[PDB]
Amino acid sequence: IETVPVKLKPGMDGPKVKQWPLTEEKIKALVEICTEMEKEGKISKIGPENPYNTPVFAIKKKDSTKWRKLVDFRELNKRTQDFWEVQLGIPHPAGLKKKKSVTVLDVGDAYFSVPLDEDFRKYTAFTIPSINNETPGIRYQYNVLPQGWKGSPAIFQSSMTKILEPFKKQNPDIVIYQYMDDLYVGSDLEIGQHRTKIEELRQHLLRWGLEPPFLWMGYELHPDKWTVQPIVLPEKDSWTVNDIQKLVGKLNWASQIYPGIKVRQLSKLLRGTKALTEVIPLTEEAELELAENREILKEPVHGVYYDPSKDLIAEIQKQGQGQWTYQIYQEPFKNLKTGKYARMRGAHTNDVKQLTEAVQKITTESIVIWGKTPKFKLPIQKETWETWWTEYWQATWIPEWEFVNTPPLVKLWYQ
Amino acid sequence: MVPISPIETVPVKLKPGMDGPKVKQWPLTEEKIKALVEICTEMEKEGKISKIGPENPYNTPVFAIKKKDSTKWRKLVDFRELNKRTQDFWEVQLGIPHPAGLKKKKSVTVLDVGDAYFSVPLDEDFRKYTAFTIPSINNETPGIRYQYNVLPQGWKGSPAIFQSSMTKILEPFAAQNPDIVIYQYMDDLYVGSDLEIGQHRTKIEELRQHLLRWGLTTPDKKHQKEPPFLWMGYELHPDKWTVQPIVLPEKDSWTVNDIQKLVGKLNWASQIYPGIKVRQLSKLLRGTKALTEVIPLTEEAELELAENREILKEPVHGVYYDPSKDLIAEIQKQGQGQWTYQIYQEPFKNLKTGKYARMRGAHTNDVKQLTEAVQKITTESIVIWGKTPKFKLPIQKETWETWWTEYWQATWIPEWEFVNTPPLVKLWYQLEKEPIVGAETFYVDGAANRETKLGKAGYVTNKGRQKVVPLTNTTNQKTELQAIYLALQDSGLEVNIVTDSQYALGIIQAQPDKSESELVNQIIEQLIKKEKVYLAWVPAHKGIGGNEQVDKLVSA
Numbered sequence: 001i002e003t004v005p006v007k008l009k010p011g012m013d014g015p016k017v018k019q020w021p022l023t024e025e026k027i028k029a030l031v032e033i034c035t036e037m038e039k040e041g042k043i044s045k046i047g048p049e050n051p052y053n054t055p056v057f058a059i060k061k062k063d064s065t066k067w068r069k070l071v072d073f074r075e076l077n078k079r080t081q082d083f084w085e086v087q088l089g090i091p092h093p094a095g096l097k098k099k100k101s102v103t104v105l106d107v108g109d110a111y112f113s114v115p116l117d118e119d120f121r122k123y124t125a126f127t128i129p130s131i132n133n134e135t136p137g138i139r140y141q142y143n144v145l146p147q148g149w150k151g152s153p154a155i156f157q158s159s160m161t162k163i164l165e166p167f168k169k170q171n172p173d174i175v176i177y178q179y180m181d182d183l184y185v186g187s188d189l190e191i192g193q194h195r196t197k198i199e200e201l202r203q204h205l206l207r208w209g210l211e212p213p214f215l216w217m218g219y220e221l222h223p224d225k226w227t228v229q230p231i232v233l234p235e236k237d238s239w240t241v242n243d244i245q246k247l248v249g250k251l252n253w254a255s256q257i258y259p260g261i262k263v264r265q266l267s268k269l270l271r272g273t274k275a276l277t278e279v280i281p282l283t284e285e286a287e288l289e290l291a292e293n294r295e296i297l298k299e300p301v302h303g304v305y306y307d308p309s310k311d312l313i314a315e316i317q318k319q320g321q322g323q324w325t326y327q328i329y330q331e332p333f334k335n336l337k338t339g340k341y342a343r344m345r346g347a348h349t350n351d352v353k354q355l356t357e358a359v360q361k362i363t364t365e366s367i368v369i370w371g372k373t374p375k376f377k378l379p380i381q382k383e384t385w386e387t388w389w390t391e392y393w394q395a396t397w398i399p400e401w402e403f404v405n406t407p408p409l410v411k412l413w414y415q
Numbered sequence: 416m417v418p419i420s421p422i423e424t425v426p427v428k429l430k431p432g433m434d435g436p437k438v439k440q441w442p443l444t445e446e447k448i449k450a451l452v453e454i455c456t457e458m459e460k461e462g463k464i465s466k467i468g469p470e471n472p473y474n475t476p477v478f479a480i481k482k483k484d485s486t487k488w489r490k491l492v493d494f495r496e497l498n499k500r501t502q503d504f505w506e507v508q509l510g511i512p513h514p515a516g517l518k519k520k521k522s523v524t525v526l527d528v529g530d531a532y533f534s535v536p537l538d539e540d541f542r543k544y545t546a547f548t549i550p551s552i553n554n555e556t557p558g559i560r561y562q563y564n565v566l567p568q569g570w571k572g573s574p575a576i577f578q579s580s581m582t583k584i585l586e587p588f589a590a591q592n593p594d595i596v597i598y599q600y601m602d603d604l605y606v607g608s609d610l611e612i613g614q615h616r617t618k619i620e621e622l623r624q625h626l627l628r629w630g631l632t633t634p635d636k637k638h639q640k641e642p643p644f645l646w647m648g649y650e651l652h653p654d655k656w657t658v659q660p661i662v663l664p665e666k667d668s669w670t671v672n673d674i675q676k677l678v679g680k681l682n683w684a685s686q687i688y689p690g691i692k693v694r695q696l697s698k699l700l701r702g703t704k705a706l707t708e709v710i711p712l713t714e715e716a717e718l719e720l721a722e723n724r725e726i727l728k729e730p731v732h733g734v735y736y737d738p739s740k741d742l743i744a745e746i747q748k749q750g751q752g753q754w755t756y757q758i759y760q761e762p763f764k765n766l767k768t769g770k771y772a773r774m775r776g777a778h779t780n781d782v783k784q785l786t787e788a789v790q791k792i793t794t795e796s797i798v799i800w801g802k803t804p805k806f807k808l809p810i811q812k813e814t815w816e817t818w819w820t821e822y823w824q825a826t827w828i829p830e831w832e833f834v835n836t837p838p839l840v841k842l843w844y845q846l847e848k849e850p851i852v853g854a855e856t857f858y859v860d861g862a863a864n865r866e867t868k869l870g871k872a873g874y875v876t877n878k879g880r881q882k883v884v885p886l887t888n889t890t891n892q893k894t895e896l897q898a899i900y901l902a903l904q905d906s907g908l909e910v911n912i913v914t915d916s917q918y919a920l921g922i923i924q925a926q927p928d929k930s931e932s933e934l935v936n937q938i939i940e941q942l943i944k945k946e947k948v949y950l951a952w953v954p955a956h957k958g959i960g961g962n963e964q965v966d967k968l969v970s971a
């Protein structure tokens with residue numbers, strides 16, 4: 001009820017980010033949402049003496065026909081002070097990734113009950129654009145903690161901790177983790193119990209609220225089943241010259257990750273200048289080297305550690321037929337997680353919708369395991385991504401990304 | 416008196432850490448001083464400026480101009496220094512409406528609101544920074560110090576604060592009169608509607624009454640300005656729009672500046688004149704910056720200019736947007752990386768036209784360029800109309816599906832339909848996914864010496880066919896490509912090629928059909944003639960046979 005002082009980082013002005021083009025449907029939705037928010041006091045109209053701006057758009061979350069306002073605070077979040085005073089930071093709970101079920105709840109509406117420091121409000125300015133710029137854009141700023149701003153969970157932490165105390169004491173084996181507007185709730189219960197504890201949790205925030213438009217929703221994850229992708233080599237009875245070349249290529253790549261990989265004996269099977277489809281019998285020497293390589297590949301990689309002071313990087317490859325492979329790392333050749341997806345929801349004709357859902361899934365996994373989002377290197381031209389990603393976004397956070405314009409050879413080795 | 420509602424002031428600040436301006440007033444002739452004294456006495460009588468004491472330490476120079484009427488002198492306060500020190504504002508004018516997004520109007524009336532222009536109050540605390548001095552006759556008394564009580568013409572914040580203040584006043588009227596549109600430009604209000612003319616004029620009278628609540632008077636006569644309107648380089652008519660007349664000069668010789676102006680006029684005309692091209696004319700500006708330099712026009716540039724003159728020989732008009740109908744966007748390939756499009760709703764009546772040019776780069780293909788043009792037009796359409804048009808594209812449905820399913824990047828184009836108007840975009844070659852049985856296998860390699868720029872390129876095959884060619888003025892990368900070229904030139908219609916060149920694979924996996932490298936273009940022309948090509952990669956220096964032999968032959 002009285003505000004926490006907030007300021008930007010030293011020597012750093014507010015965000016001045018262009019509003020990108022919005023569709024008629026998104027504009028009408030935002031006009032309706034912001035008119036209501038203004039009546040409830042959450043935002044106020046501003047004048048031209050405020051030159052700041054953050055982009056805004058709207059999303060229709062999974063299994064809902066109500067539009068949600070999403071502000072892209074990435075620039076403001078970078079420019080905002082670090083909140084290492086409330087706490088040096090809440091240690092990331094390593095047990096969250098080990099629960100059989102984790103439900104994700106949108107609790108962002110709770111933030112609107114805490115006022116925002118009057119000296120910081122100007123930096124949350126945003127614009128609702130008009131079609132064809134025929135009327136001046138509607139300019140607002142926030143009077144309360146906004147959804148998506150990194151300061152909102154930090155300032156609301158003290159209030160969240162006490163709202164949840166009765167539920168936590170009474171359910172001590174539940175893991176609760178907050179990331180931005182998300183609450184992740186993990187249990188080892190059978191799902192029916194799980195869903196009823198989740199609903200127990202909802203009414204603690206309803207009780208306290210006394211209405212939140214998206215608390216009822218529940219995104220269910222099962223991180224104990226999450227699959228990884230070790231390096232496997234083919235098992236064949238007949239090797240062609242082409243098969244052995246692809247094998248030697250893959251092993252050469254794997255030897256940058258695994259020290260003792262050897263290809264001398266397998267490369268000597270390529271002794272001469274043979275037709276690519278010709279079948280080559282393995283020598284005993286080659287079989288032995290191949291088997292020794294297999295056993296090396298069944299071990300973990302050496303010297304792999306997570307460092308919370310370094311960025312996570314996520315790379316994604318398109319494998320075709322709706323299949324995508326991905327790797328998360330901080331140092332090259334030191335993967336912290338690898339994976340593969342194929343359940344591209346409702347996108348069998350749309351590469352970009354599939355890629356966008358992969359990005360959201362990888363971010364979710366990243367939040368659960370390390371409590372932060374990775375920086376993506378996306379196999380897509382910037383213009384195509386920038387024009388379509390917002391049409392398929394269903395998350396309340398937005399990660400960072402860059403674009404890969406040169407095809408990697410590594411695609412072949414993660415297939 | 417009738418109480419008027421006051422205009423709330425916008426709080427204004429200087430940039431952090433800066434103080435106000437303290438600029439020397441220049442000396443002026445006795446004649447100019449008298450002119451400024453009279454002008455300012457009337458401005459003070461009107462409330463726009465106020466005489467101040469000597470305590471204020473700020474100052475901005477004032478000048479006298481003249482030449483408009485009876486050669487009578489004018490007044491100019493030079494706020495360049497204060498502008499540098501004034502905060503940044505939100506600018507709304509950055510987004511100009513595009514005529515193609517406007518709607519048809521039966522009536523558009525213009526009202527003059529310049530009395531409001533010079534009557535918006537200035538934040539009381541900021542006035543001190545606007546102080547200026549009229550010098551005294553013969554410098555024998557103190558100059559007449561003053562300060563602005565109203566938004567000063569020439570001050571950085573005046574346009575933004577004026578627009579914000581007028582918008583706030585008009586918002587109630589517009590919300591409660593949804594059957595009109597209102598647009599402010601300069602000192603005029605444009606009010607459009609589809610009402611019968613009596614109801615339209617009634618709404619205008621009601622708008623005039625609304626403005627008097629803030630003390631704003633509107634001339635009671637007929638505004639001079641009437642359709643068509645000359646606005647932002649356009650002509651707006653009640654039911655149509657066009658660009659202002661585009662006249663291409665005749666000239667026997669062209670300077671850099673002449674070609675820059677021609678390209679500007681052509682770029683401007685490209686929004687309604689279909690098929691404008693500027694590639695060959697823009698090529699003449701490459702890497703140069705001498706504005707007086709005369710460039711001989713290529714025969715390529717002369718044909719392009721001649722084609723443009725033909726396109727521009729009579730007026731073409733665009734129609735306005737009917738929201739009740741779908742938008743269609745049609746694209747054509749023009750050659751040399753150039754693309755042109757039309758956006759229409761009814762056949763043969765374009766709302767607008769446009770063009771797209773290939774981005775600078777080493778290698779490219781028609782499908783990527785077409786994809787880029789689609790994404791450009793989609794974004795433009797979102798800005799102007801708020802929705803994506805349905806596309807008509809010169810590419811077969813089966814070509815697109817083969818392309819995106821096998822391309823290494825994610826790619827997507829929204830709802831479209833094939834339009835069979837040549838030249839069609841097609842795939843010129845497609846690499847095999849598996850090695851070819853029965854096709855000769857070429858193991859290729861190249862190497863060069865970095866100092867002497869001497870190299871070798873060659874291959875050996877499973878049938879015992881071999882070639883090594885010595886090369887000069889080359890690099891490792893060029894010899895890697897040459898070796899692949901040799902294997903293509905010497906094989907039959909089906910061929911397997913084994914290379915260790917990551918560089919060459921990265922190029923071919925990007926599937927160029929045209930390149931800045933003539934060597935890549937030669938490879939592409941060879942690939943087009945084959946029926947099957949399988950390109951296999953192996954790591955260098957690993958004893959891979961075939962590979963090992965030719966790298967030896969070529970590194971010698």
Ligand SMILES: Cc1cc(/C=C/C#N)cc(C)c1Nc1ccnc(Nc2ccc(C#N)cc2)n1
Pocket residue numbers: 134512516517518519520523596597598600605606607642643644645646651652653654735
């Ligand atoms: C952008 C704009 C510039 C001018 C004027 C600028 C000036 N000078 C005048 C108006 C009224 C507008 N406002 C809008 C908004 C939506 N549809 C339209 N349609 C429309 C406007 C003018 C004519 C005409 N003749 C026809 C249709 N105008």
Ligand SMILES: [Mg+2]
Pocket residue numbers: 860861862955966970
């Ligand atoms: Mg070599």
